Amino acid sequence: RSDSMSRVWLTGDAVVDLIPDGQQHYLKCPGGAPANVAVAIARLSGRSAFFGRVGNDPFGRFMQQTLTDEQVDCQHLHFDPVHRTSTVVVDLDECGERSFTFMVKPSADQFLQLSDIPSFQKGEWLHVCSIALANQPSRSSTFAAIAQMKEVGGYVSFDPNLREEVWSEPQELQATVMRAVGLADVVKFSEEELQFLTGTQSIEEGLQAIADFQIPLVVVTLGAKGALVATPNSQQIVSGKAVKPIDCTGAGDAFVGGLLYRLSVAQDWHNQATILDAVKWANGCGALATTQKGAMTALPNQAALYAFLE
Amino acid sequence: RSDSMSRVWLTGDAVVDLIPDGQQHYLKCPGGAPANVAVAIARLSGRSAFFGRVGNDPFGRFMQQTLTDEQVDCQHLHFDPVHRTSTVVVDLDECGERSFTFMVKPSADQFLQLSDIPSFQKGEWLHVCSIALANQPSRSSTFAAIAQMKEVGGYVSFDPNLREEVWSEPQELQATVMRAVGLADVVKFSEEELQFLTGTQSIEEGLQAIADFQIPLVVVTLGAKGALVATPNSQQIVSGKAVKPIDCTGAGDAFVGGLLYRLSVAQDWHNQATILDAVKWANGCGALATTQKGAMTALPNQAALYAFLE
Numbered sequence: 001r002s003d004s005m006s007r008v009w010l011t012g013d014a015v016v017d018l019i020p021d022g023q024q025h026y027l028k029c030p031g032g033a034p035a036n037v038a039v040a041i042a043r044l045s046g047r048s049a050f051f052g053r054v055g056n057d058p059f060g061r062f063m064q065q066t067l068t069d070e071q072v073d074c075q076h077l078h079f080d081p082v083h084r085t086s087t088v089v090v091d092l093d094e095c096g097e098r099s100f101t102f103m104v105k106p107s108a109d110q111f112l113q114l115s116d117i118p119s120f121q122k123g124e125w126l127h128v129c130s131i132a133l134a135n136q137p138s139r140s141s142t143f144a145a146i147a148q149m150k151e152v153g154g155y156v157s158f159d160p161n162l163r164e165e166v167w168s169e170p171q172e173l174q175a176t177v178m179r180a181v182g183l184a185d186v187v188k189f190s191e192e193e194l195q196f197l198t199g200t201q202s203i204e205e206g207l208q209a210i211a212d213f214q215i216p217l218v219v220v221t222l223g224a225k226g227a228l229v230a231t232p233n234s235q236q237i238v239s240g241k242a243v244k245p246i247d248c249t250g251a252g253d254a255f256v257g258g259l260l261y262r263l264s265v266a267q268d269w270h271n272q273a274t275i276l277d278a279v280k281w282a283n284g285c286g287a288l289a290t291t292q293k294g295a296m297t298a299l300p301n302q303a304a305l306y307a308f309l310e
Numbered sequence: 311r312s313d314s315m316s317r318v319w320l321t322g323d324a325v326v327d328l329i330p331d332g333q334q335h336y337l338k339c340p341g342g343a344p345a346n347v348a349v350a351i352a353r354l355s356g357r358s359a360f361f362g363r364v365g366n367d368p369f370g371r372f373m374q375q376t377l378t379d380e381q382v383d384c385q386h387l388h389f390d391p392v393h394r395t396s397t398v399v400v401d402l403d404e405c406g407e408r409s410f411t412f413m414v415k416p417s418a419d420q421f422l423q424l425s426d427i428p429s430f431q432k433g434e435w436l437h438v439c440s441i442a443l444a445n446q447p448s449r450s451s452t453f454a455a456i457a458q459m460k461e462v463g464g465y466v467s468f469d470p471n472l473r474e475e476v477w478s479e480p481q482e483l484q485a486t487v488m489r490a491v492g493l494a495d496v497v498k499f500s501e502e503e504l505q506f507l508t509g510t511q512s513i514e515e516g517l518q519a520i521a522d523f524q525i526p527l528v529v530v531t532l533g534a535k536g537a538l539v540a541t542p543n544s545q546q547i548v549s550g551k552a553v554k555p556i557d558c559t560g561a562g563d564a565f566v567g568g569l570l571y572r573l574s575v576a577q578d579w580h581n582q583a584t585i586l587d588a589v590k591w592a593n594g595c596g597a598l599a600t601t602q603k604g605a606m607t608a609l610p611n612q613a614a615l616y617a618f619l620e
């Protein structure tokens with residue numbers, strides 16, 4: 001027959017990450033979780049497309065140029081006439097949520113409109129993170145996009161990727177995020193995120209707490225220990241090569257990029273061997289992404305990833 | 311008798327200027343026009359104090375640490391619980407307003423409150439720029455501070471320092487700025503600013519247009535040609551050494567710093583010889599400030615300034 005490379009849509013925040021380098025200097029690094037995933041998929045020769053809003057400013061034009069250079073489809077990237085592109089300062093002493101300071105609140109992406117959503121098609125993927133749910137109108141626009149992708153027979157990937165300070169009403173984060181968890185085909189958590197969102201003290205408890213959601217695939221990253229893969233009535237650990245991280249920025253998005261790339265090119269992404277293989281790629285991408293400063297810098301192509309996987 | 315070094319109060323925006331340096335890098339430079347003037351006065355061994363608002367964030371704490379290191383009194387620098395410190399990207403191909411992109415709108419300084427204003431005393435100075443007038447509540451708070459300084463028998467310095475993009479209602483800029491021009495003892499313009507604000511095509515026309523304001527001292531900077539000094543029924547050019555600029559960022563604030571330092575230590579700042587001498591210092595400071603990247607970096611001490619003046 002013929003191969004079927006499905007398009008992956010990414011939406012949310014494209015951001016400039018200011019990363020200390022020699023510091024009284026910052027590296028000007030392209031970033032923003034869904035932009036990172038888009039570039040990760042494209043670098044692996046996948047088919048990714050971004051829709052959303054950046055600012056009509058140099059940082060916004062920098063992110064548009066970056067995504068375009070990386071062969072990400074940006075036909076549906078919009079430039080807001082008023083609001084500025086997200087600008088984030090990174091603390092290299094931390095990893096994850098604790099490492100980021102958001103200087104632009106609310107940034108242009110928070111003003112995502114219904115009209116920004118492109119036509120979706122059966123079999124396509126949509127990936128979203130929680131910053132897209134942080135404030136209106138992006139929150140309601142993003143939930144509408146999710147419902148539309150489900151309706152047309154596409155698939156939904158959700159990575160909470162929690163950044164509480166972005167929420168003008170942080171008391172709304174837990175419920176809003178769990179509503180999106182309830183819409184997804186694929187959900188990726190860090191260990192801490194799963195426990196926080198479900199109010200549990202163990203991964204096992206956390207998984208039992210969302211069993212009612214009947215999620216096809218839940219993946220819980222375990223840092224160096226790889227990832228727990230949860231499918232209906234089944235859990236297993238998939239572990240890869242451990243590396244000493246130089247810059248953890250973007251590791252989780254790289255992980256999601258490898259995962260979604262392999263799901264997107266699969267005959268049937270629900271196939272258990274397909275999923276386990278996709279997580280092996282995800283682990284490899286996550287490790288490699290830490291080897292250079294910047295979320296996107298070390299996102300691997302297939303030659304590099306295969307060489308690393310052995 | 312005894313010398314009388316008057317305190318100069320500065321209020322408005324303290325900002326982090328991101329200046330290309332090796333660029334895919336930015337230099338992280340302390341800045342913001344009234345913060346620049348405060349540091350310029352302190353470096354010349356004057357008595358400067360800052361009141362206003364920065365964000366409760368690393369950039370805000372960086373500016374507090376900077377002003378403190380520079381011996382600027384920061385007892386009245388406040389940290390806003392919600393809004394972020396102003397962050398500005400600099401274009402080295404431009405000078406003045408055209409070189410700055412404001413990423414944080416509205417930044418913490420725009421939320422200056424009546425309670426942020428310190429007690430003023432007779433003979434003290436207050437210096438303000440137009441960003442403090444850009445939006446509420448800072449606009450009304452700053453006009454209140456101005457009226458209070460006038461009432462107690464202090465002096466008011468105003469440097470429009472126009473940055474239109476900071477105004478949520480830019481159609482209000484001209485009238486709002488000219489209202490402040492009408493309150494000042496000392497006003498400093500660039501040539502372009504004077505003509506723009508008065509809607510005239512020459513400096514001479516611009517000066518005639520504000521004659522009705524009965525301003526004690528108007529200074530119009532002329533780039534390398536020095537400055538025009540306008541006092542009642544009198545104008546003269548004061549020119550100093552021309553330098554080849556390396557980074558024009560902060561030149562105008564350095565100029566104001568030298569000017570206000572010498573006015574602040576004078577027996578009678580209205581004295582014409584005093585004023586002309588103060589402008590000679592101002593010119594020297596303006597030139598020296600261009601010799602390094604960053605608004606504050608090359609603000610001179612007296613040893614450097616005297617050596618440059620000859």
Ligand SMILES: Nc1ncnc2c1ncn2[C@@H]1O[C@H](COP(=O)(O)OP(=O)(O)O)[C@@H](O)[C@H]1O
Nearest residue numbers: 190221223224226242243251252255283286287
């Ligand atoms: N030292 C490390 N060695 C190998 N892989 C790592 C390492 N750190 C992170 N990763 C990889 O990248 C993924 C992301 O790691 P993680 O710390 O859980 O990021 P996040 O909390 O954002 O999900 C891991 O699942 C793992 O596959």
Ligand SMILES: Nc1ncnc2c1ncn2[C@@H]1O[C@H](COP(=O)(O)OP(=O)(O)O)[C@@H](O)[C@H]1O
Nearest residue numbers: 500531533534536552553561562565593596597
């Ligand atoms: N090439 C230059 N050579 C000497 N002095 C300069 C030079 N450029 C700027 N200055 C000094 O610094 C001041 C500020 O210059 P200017 O270009 O008018 O800045 P601004 O437009 O912000 O007021 C000048 O009045 C002048 O005294």
Ligand SMILES: OC[C@H]1O[C@](O)(CO)[C@@H](O)[C@@H]1O
Nearest residue numbers: 031032033088100250253295
């Ligand atoms: O996941 C890493 C990414 O997440 C963010 O914090 C927000 O989207 C970015 O600053 C960073 O590149």
Ligand SMILES: OC[C@H]1O[C@](O)(CO)[C@@H](O)[C@@H]1O
Nearest residue numbers: 341342343398410560563605
């Ligand atoms: O006058 C120079 C200063 O003016 C600003 O643009 C705003 O206050 C700063 O970015 C800069 O340091």
Ligand SMILES: [Ca+2]
Nearest residue numbers: 161162252253
């Ligand atoms: Ca993450």
Ligand SMILES: [Ca+2]
Nearest residue numbers: 471472562563
């Ligand atoms: Ca100026």
Ligand SMILES: [K+]
Nearest residue numbers: 247289292294
């Ligand atoms: K990295």
Ligand SMILES: [K+]
Nearest residue numbers: 557599602604
């Ligand atoms: K400079």
